[PDB]
Design an enzyme around this catalytic site. Structure first.
Site, short mmCIF file in Angstrom:
data_model
loop_
_atom_site.label_atom_id
_atom_site.label_comp_id
_atom_site.label_asym_id
_atom_site.label_seq_id
_atom_site.Cartn_x
_atom_site.Cartn_y
_atom_site.Cartn_z
N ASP B 58 0.85 -1.05 0.10
CA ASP B 58 0.11 0.00 -0.01
C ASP B 58 1.00 1.26 0.14
N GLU B 86 12.93 1.28 -10.23
CA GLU B 86 13.86 -0.01 -10.52
C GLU B 86 13.23 -0.97 -10.17
OE1 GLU B 86 17.75 0.31 -10.14
OE2 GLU B 86 18.17 -1.02 -11.67
N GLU B 87 13.65 -1.58 -9.38
CA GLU B 87 13.38 -2.83 -8.53
C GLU B 87 12.36 -2.25 -7.35
OE1 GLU B 87 18.01 -2.77 -8.97
OE2 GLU B 87 17.21 -4.16 -7.20
N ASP B 107 11.78 12.56 -3.97
CA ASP B 107 11.48 11.10 -3.59
C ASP B 107 10.18 11.52 -2.43
OD1 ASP B 107 12.19 8.40 -3.04
OD2 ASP B 107 13.96 8.99 -1.80
N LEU B 109 8.34 9.37 -0.88
CA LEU B 109 8.33 8.58 0.12
C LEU B 109 9.74 7.91 0.31
CD1 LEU B 109 4.51 7.26 0.55
CD2 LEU B 109 5.75 9.27 1.74
N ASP B 110 10.31 7.57 1.93
CA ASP B 110 11.28 7.01 1.98
C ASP B 110 11.34 5.69 1.59
OD1 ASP B 110 10.25 6.57 4.41
OD2 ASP B 110 11.81 7.12 5.33
#
Lengths: 323, 330, 328, 325
Positions: B58, B86-87, B107, B109-110
């Site tokens: 989520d 990416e992954e 970014d 969310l971390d």
């Protein structure tokens, strides 16, 4: 369809699982928890910064909000412990034992904190500074017996979301505070902690203070499976936060005894019991290393015990090492 | 009310900085739109269990809506593209000013992990003064190669910040002259300055690493972790704290001191954190607060990004703790 | 008892047996609909173009229906003229009928600073609705509802929620008037006054005096005489929001007199007897005031037509009695 | 949210329509108002030792002072009478003076459903500033330096009612921002508001009818005549100056606070209440008069000067002027 905590509580009171009196208590507890959340969130602004001072204010909001149910006394901390609020119904039917916040360390409250509460059905009256003396404390300890008269337990976690977790003794229910409307909304019914979990949560900075039995345990968690993945380590420092994460994703959380804290740091009655009652309702286990926490009757005023809690299979594993 | 006190909102604070000519009116609007995007991301984080009871990992889907929120909030400033994850990485939003004076690397969310965002998460951003244009909404290979030559952490990084979403919502900002700390006032919907010129302690007996990976580390790293545990003469070893949320763990470090590490290991041969998106803005914040950001050998900010999703080990925190680690790895 | 919320106060009425658990829930559900209507009224300019009082009446009735789903089924009495559509809930058990006015008008002018919901709870002798716009009740359900809800004999509780500078939930379950204030920080209604009593006198009159040339000669004289400064030299103060809930609430608190009389155009008054007049008269009487149609007690009048209207004089007992002397 | 007040302010500053300095001031004001909105909504709760409109006036002035303390020093003009104490902020720079009415009355009756803060921002020609009561000579200085006719740069109000609405004009038309209770931000909901040119709504305390001049009595009695249309004027009068004014702005009509036997020169105060509202109404296309002259033409000479006020839809106001001549 969104069910609020209040509706849910009126439905439980309507099916007679809980009395009107108990309904009031729970509803007031949740109104204190909304006020404490707001204190915790605005603390930097309000201080224009001690977790200890917050501990105190939070006890006062508790008192105010439960004043219509009963009197509240304070079990003061001469150690680094949080001061404990003890509410005693005017009626005699209920005693509520409330930790306002889950530590007194700024460091440990950096990202999360939480209130913890346990409600008991007493067989004697104990409440007569707002501080309770040694005598009132003794009374509390004898009348509050987790393995025989603990009816309801819960916590509220204050972190990126505000989460109220309750168990009147039929399963665990999760309520999330909706910031747009200021109401606790039922978001999970009959929460179940996984049986197994490859997550461990201990302050590994104390490893050289632990018995040889525990060290081996910890050393083996770091051995990669045949799958090649070792356990993941997560440790917030916040008892509620770390408990909460365990309850949801599984694993094991531990506060062992060490060379400095010979019987552990967590208190049996105020912290370990309400959490062990919750984790058991969710399907997990709470132990002290050898015994089930709720089988230990509280006998002394500041009784501490070591705590291993979380997925059943993770806790059984630790107990084999300690046996 | 009582005696009296001064409440500086972020807006006023940015307008002061513009008035002193430290920053531009343009930058003023960018930093202010960034903070509105964080205010809305904060509300999305807070209500995720409720909004998942409808719609209106989520943590992955949250990553994506956050990036839309960020595009919508900076729309008066520039156009936003996305660098596809990416992954299990978080997709990164890149906004470029219509004027071409600024690029923001955001970014949302971390992490994309639920376990690691259980109690805290946060947005990370970097503002660069580019030498070219790289779009003037997935960014393709060409745009991704342009962004990497234009955004140079060691030279044109003008401002860096983060917003942490935890028991409080905290916006941490540096525009090149000290680190400033704003607390979101949930009553009034504004960030309020609550700390100025933050300084991270020069030392601190707190380490933050995922020790579950200890058997995947190099022996020099293992020796360093092992010594931290030795009780000194006072009998106190270091304390371990690891939320697993980079922003959460960093914020704690910045406030109380210590060291945070995300090393390379036998599985993540180059570490996990990304240089440009995560390590570089964080190292810039730490050096403005007086600490150090290293890859275990070198100053993170001296490493030139040459490959988009390039990763690097990170050792960040208190100057002496970092120095001590680099002494064990040399 | 320092902070008593509405949930706790209701559960204490149930414990003392003044109310039923069923009603406790009907009440607590009414108050949740009012909380959400408050937030709609507050954000109304935003939700259009971050605006019609008519459209808010409709969504408000659907929030009420959703909030009362666990207690019963809800249908709607379609508004005759410029009247607000009334939601009517019939508890699944047959014990209670709730008659809910979502907002107190359909004009934007009259809702510029305040509006409010009004409700009455009746203990019925029959079943009206059945099954499930859907919502719209036909002629026959409407007549049933008008026949079953008798203000003078089975009206058990009544209240209103005013949406203004503060959000105020006012209620009477038959034993005094209780005031709950919405605490916007914590989303709960909190007890802020117990047993309110409207003053027996108050030099405040609230009427739309733009209608003066349309009124009857007896009323013009009454109005004219309020303007005479006395021996004190201080005539009455005129205040009139045009929000029925707003004006009534001010009257309840500070005393005085509110009137919506019959005139040349509206030959029988404007306010409806059952939907508006009855719940408010029951509240004013529980606060010790009076609710008349000028000659008779509103709760003595039996509603006999669906949209029956009546002139209303309400407020401080001595003030109502004085208009009553001039209209005799 | 869509366009917020903070976004809209930063664009104006960026178009060079207003200074940074003034943008800081306006921003601080809207912060103070979001806190006052809160105090007003929770007054009944706060007053349980955990109610008087007068107490709230005081607390609102301290909120204002903390929010503006970064821009300048705050002082208080009291009227031991029934007037709200007025806060007066003077920038540290000396470029701006804000005169702020925390709430629009000190009566509980008139604040029953609505109330509101009113402010005017002035570019002074001298410094007046030095338990912030200003002494007489500081009050006299304020009055000579704030000249509604020439250096009043921006005016507004924040109404606290069923909605919280921040109405602002910086000299180019009137903008309406609604507070979003979900998000805590003021959201632009109306640009270049224009009050209608006429309106058959009149807002006066008609309880005072037998105390008005003979010229005013007939104007009142004529609004009650149904035209050949059969519809007389509609009376509305909240008692709250901000609320009555706001409804007039939006829906047209006229609001009046005339002189009477008791209040020889009216009740509202020229500089604190009448001037800022007259500026707004003018920016919205309406009129602000004292019954014979333009309000903003009158130069304040006394500390607490009062003036009769007739404001609202130009035609309605001209119509009253006709009967008063």
């Amino acid at each position: 369809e969104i069910i609020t905590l209040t509706s849910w509580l009126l439905q439980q009171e309507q099916k007679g699982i809980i009395d009107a009196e108990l309904t009031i208590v729970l509803s007031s507890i949740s109104m204190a928890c909304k006020q404490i959340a707001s204190l915790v969130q605005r603390a930097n602004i309000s201080n224009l910064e001690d977790q200890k001072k917050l501990d105190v204010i939070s006890n006062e909001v508790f008192s105010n909000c439960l004043r219509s149910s009963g009197r509240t006394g304070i079990i003061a901390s001469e150690e680094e412990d949080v001061p404990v609020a003890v509410e005693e119904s005017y009626s005699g039917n209920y005693i509520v034992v409330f930790d306002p916040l889950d530590g007194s360390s700024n460091l440990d409250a950096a990202v999360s904190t939480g209130s913890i509460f346990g409600i008991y059905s007493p067989n004697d009256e104990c409440l007569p500074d707002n501080t309770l003396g040694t005598e009132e404390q003794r009374c509390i300890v004898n009348v509050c017996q987790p393995g025989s008269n603990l009816l309801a337990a819960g916590y509220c976690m204050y972190s990126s979301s505000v989460i109220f977790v309750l168990t009147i003794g039929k399963g665990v229910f999760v309520f999330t505070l909706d910031p747009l409307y200021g109401e606790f909304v039922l978001t999970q019914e009959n929460l179940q902690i996984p049986k197994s979990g490859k997550i461990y949560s201990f302050n590994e900075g104390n490893y050289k203070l632990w018995d040889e039995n525990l060290k081996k345990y910890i050393d083996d968690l770091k051995e990669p499976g045949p799958s090649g993945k070792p356990y993941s380590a997560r440790y917030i420092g916040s008892l509620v936060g770390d408990f909460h994460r365990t309850l949801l994703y599984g694993g094991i959380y531990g506060y062992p005894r060490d060379k400095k804290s010979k019987n552990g740091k967590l208190r049996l009655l105020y912290e370990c019991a309400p959490m062990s009652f919750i984790v058991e309702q969710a399907g997990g286990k709470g132990s002290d290393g050898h015994q089930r926490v709720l089988d230990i009757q509280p006998t002394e005023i500041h009784q501490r015990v070591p705590l291993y809690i979380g997925s059943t299979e993770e806790v059984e594993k630790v107990e084999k090492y300690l046996a």
